[PDB]
């Protein structure tokens, strides 16, 4: 290990939450579900940050509740039971609970118990908008008149932002939250640790991972070797209490410049061709590409994590679409463009490139001994930003999915061919 | 957790012992394999209580030593090797042992090294009778003298019961110890710790999970939404020194009352139709349904722990058959009505609320936590009496399968399709 | 565990250091691929003592490093990507290495960052011979100048050795480091420790393991039930610095005789035939057969760890062959004769037996328990002189693949149905 790398001691040590926080940062807004996921009366399981959570939509509005009953631990989700609009019970013994407040309002099979009314399961906030589902995934403990607006754990808007972060060289990009926004999109379920999903996200240079993408040589682009900062602030850091926690990087301006060769290696690029887009990342780990793959169409990802080593990565194109025709235009265009080679075309090489990773990190051994440089200046910004700005750092999972990795269940679905997933398999 | 739960601090204290208990009870007696597992000459291996057995037949008697070569422990079930009607040798170098004694004999390939007559192998008592053969599964030093006799560890008998359990709506069910008394049903490996899974056995509130049964449709019955207790000797509770040691739920008394409505939920039942049954539960954790599913027929269940995590669950449905009129009346019903409709249409949705509930119990998390109600009297009776009578608590495995749960070849074995089972492949 | 096995405590102190060694011993020369494995230009990953490793062969040199790069950790041999004669880049971030030195030369992506220069992965000294890629698989910090010569890692060469190992009874058997020595074989990776594998290798009493193999019965053999050693001396133990350390048998002497009876079975054998061979083992595990299968062929076996449950188990047959005739012969009677009926007819037996003894060992508890004989001086001794000889006992893995046992890629993997293994998957 040299002392010329970036990360010295000093460094590691201004992001040690960000270390211990593999399990996720916990009491934020994640993505649950497309709203096409979840229909009415439709019920559905899933786990962010360790916390089983099981969504029903009744009468057009989703409610969220810890999927795990409290007399003997069953996940509610795994058979959907409800008898009536306001309630979910559990399909073992009847334990039932208030969709709204999550109280046990009452138990199917001894509706005179004294447990009934003195507890319940805890409730999750929701935030449906423009096909999204958002869940506030927190601590049983949290309290609800704490629950932050969703807005401030979606990144920057504009033209909200367009003084404070000036975009000369392309429109305004749009949020999930504007009015008539449209969003088309997927979420995949990653296998390894969330944080070296999300820094590869925002990285600004490896070119060699996506070199050979198909879009790549049907655009004619000419990719430059990597992108160097110039100075010291060529990231921007936004901590204020109104507003999303993040960092704007000061892409295709003076503070970024292009790496055109390499003598040592007899390289050189001449003829750059490419997009002009721009990247930022706020908490929990929202990555916004504007002006991506095309004018007025942004980027959104997310890697939610699921247990300590698998997570959910979400890959979302937005662009608002006033009318009727401007919506089944960016329908078509998505579904055989924006896909087939960005989506998947593009964002595929960074599976394996994410994958490659994992194992240098999950004992810990790299947290310590990756040795950083020039370039990494921006992952190193954000791990001091996240440390300082979470809302909590999840526990691992306790009698739960995922407390235990080696259960005779998980070899069971391992041998009949079933991978680590996402969404609970219903009876 | 609320403080009106019925598992109470000092409730959970009674039962200490049921929790160590994750590899089972020790020094009990279990069904091993039916007759026609094991024909004359056969050899097979199978583990209990993460102890390895294997069996061999001669001249019509059942053998049981450890499937564990002292030498360097292969299994001697793998490759079964026999050279004369009263040993079993290990297929790599020749380790020889008595099947009566265990001893050492001789080693094939080395007859005398001073090793020889020195040691030799654990050997289990086994007691084989009307098709099922039972083993005494024991730690090594438990002394031959002590083995109690297999009526110890097996349901209480009827009529010789009869006055103390009183059953006038149904006949005397038969043991599979009476002259006559046939057997047919099956064993099926579970995924997830023994317990779990036996207390489901003997549950007497979960219409939900029944309720869509096959069965239930065809006979036109009308389930009460749950059985509540209405006095504190509804269970009672068998301690005597000469017979089993267990509990028999009075059930179709005035000690338990179904339950008709839910006034919250908006649900009630009218028109109660159903069939008379009692359910008993004895240690090791053997279960007894008599009047299942018709008069003269009774339903047996075991839990046979294999590991900490898996367990061979045993369903045997027995009648007696004086002629062999009977014997083929019975084989017929059970082979188009009892094995496709009950075996298999009403007890298969009980393996899924048993594999529900192991991720909330595996790591501890549930044995604490749990919040129990009135209705849970039964499994907490049941706790009980087995914390205070059982004849040992059975040690983790070690340097036998199952011990670690991780190796290389566990994942090969996965990796090919193969789920945790039971039976040890061949070869 | 009796007092009159051979293994007493005194004698398990003499090989504590073998018992430690469960991730094998490092700074030794092990066989990596077969020259075919590795074209020029071609990239190849792989695995020993826990080390990853990526070799390369350019302008006929084959060069080795470390498959780990020191920016994030990445496998370099996951997807092959240089850019000169002389480096090897990762495919992430363009971190580049000499093969030679394995200096950090640039960074495609950040040619001025101060990293540069002041480090750099480790190197591992590659020997080419007769189709074999041998590599020395050192720790991080063994000297250059300490790196020892190929063969002090090989087997005992003949005639140079024939006076100090007189064989009458056969022709001198070739070295992989002869002069027109051909080499014809495999390598599959197996499942279980090293050292279980290693063994077997060498064992000379399991005929029961071969006694129905094919060859056998062709060739109208009679095995003996067994060999014994007759006095102290039956094995010659060599330790001097120019040379191999190991162990050579006295196979076909009056040290050994075999055994042709067992009174108690009632076993016995008459007009034995078989053919004359010779076993010897040397550090790092090294088996040679001489006079196998036929007279002027020898067999070669390697037990090389990759982590310490997975080995990969190198099977060659060798033949000097002066002419393209004999070339052709020795070509045509291994794909026809020796590999199926030899190779895989008579070593796949061995297969099944060490991985039928894994379990015991695992998790520590075969290397005490385990109850070994008067034939067993053969394994104690090479215990023994491994634990003094060895240069060195791997660490266990960290960061790297293997070093957490049940990652959520490799429950991927195994899901997908892919075994534990070897090479590294590309791309
Ligand atoms: S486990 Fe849910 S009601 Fe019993
Ligand atoms: S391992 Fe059984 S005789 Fe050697
Ligand atoms: S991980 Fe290899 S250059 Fe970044
Ligand atoms: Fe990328
Ligand atoms: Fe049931
Ligand atoms: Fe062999």
């Not at 040690?16 to 979840?38: C, M, R, S, V």
């Not at 209490?241 to 301006?253: E, I, N, S």
């Not at 329908?331 to 896909?339: L, N, W």
Request: hydrophobic share 35%; net charge negative; glycine share 8%.
């Amino acid at each position: 290990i040299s002392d010329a790398r970036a990360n010295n001691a000093k460094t590691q040590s201004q992001y040690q939450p960000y270390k211990d926080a593999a399990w996720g940062f916990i009491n934020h807004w994640y993505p649950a579900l497309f709203t096409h996921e979840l229909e009415e009366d439709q019920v559905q399981g899933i786990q962010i940050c360790g916390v089983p959570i099981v969504l029903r939509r009744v009468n057009g509005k989703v409610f969220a509740l810890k999927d795990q009953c409290l007399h003997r631990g069953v996940r509610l989700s795994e058979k959907p039971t409800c008898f009536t609009k306001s309630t979910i019970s559990c399909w073992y013994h009847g334990f039932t609970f208030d969709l709204e407040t999550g109280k046990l309002v009452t138990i199917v099979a001894n509706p005179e118990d004294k447990l009934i009314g003195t507890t319940g399961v805890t409730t999750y906030p929701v935030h449906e908008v423009n096909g999204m589902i958002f869940v506030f995934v927190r601590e049983d403990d949290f309290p609800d008149e704490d629950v932050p607006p969703l807005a401030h754990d979606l990144p920057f808007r504009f033209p909200e932002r367009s003084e404070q972060f000036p975009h000369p060289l392309w429109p305004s990009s749009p949020s999930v939250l504007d009015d008539n926004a449209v969003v088309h999109g997927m979420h995949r379920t990653g296998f390894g640790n969330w944080r070296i999903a999300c820094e590869n996200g925002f990285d600004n240079a490896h070119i060699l991972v996506h070199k050979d993408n198909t879009i790549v040589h049907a655009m004619d682009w000419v990719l430059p070797l990597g992108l160097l900062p110039t100075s010291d602030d060529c990231i921007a850091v936004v901590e204020d209490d109104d507003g999303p926690k993040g960092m704007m990087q000061w892409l295709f301006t003076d503070k970024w410049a292009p790496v055109l060769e390499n003598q040592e290696l007899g390289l050189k690029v001449e003829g750059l061709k490419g997009r002009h887009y721009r990247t930022s990342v706020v908490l929990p780990g929202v990555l916004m590409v504007e002006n991506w793959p095309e004018e007025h169409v942004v980027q959104y990802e997310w890697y939610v994590p699921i247990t300590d080593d698998t997570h959910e990565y979400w890959e979302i194109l937005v662009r608002v679409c006033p009318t009727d025709e401007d919506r089944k235009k960016f329908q078509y265009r998505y579904d055989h463009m924006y896909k087939p080679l960005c989506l998947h075309g593009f964002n595929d090489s960074d599976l394996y490139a994410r994958e490659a990773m994992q194992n240098f990190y999950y004992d810990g051994t790299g947290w310590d001994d990756e040795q950083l440089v020039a370039t990494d200046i921006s992952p190193i910004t954000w791990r001091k930003l996240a440390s300082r700005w979470n809302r909590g750092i999840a526990k691992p999972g306790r009698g739960v999915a995922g407390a235990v990795k080696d259960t005779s269940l998980i070899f069971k679905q391992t041998a009949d061919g079933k991978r680590p997933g996402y969404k609970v398999e219903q009876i």
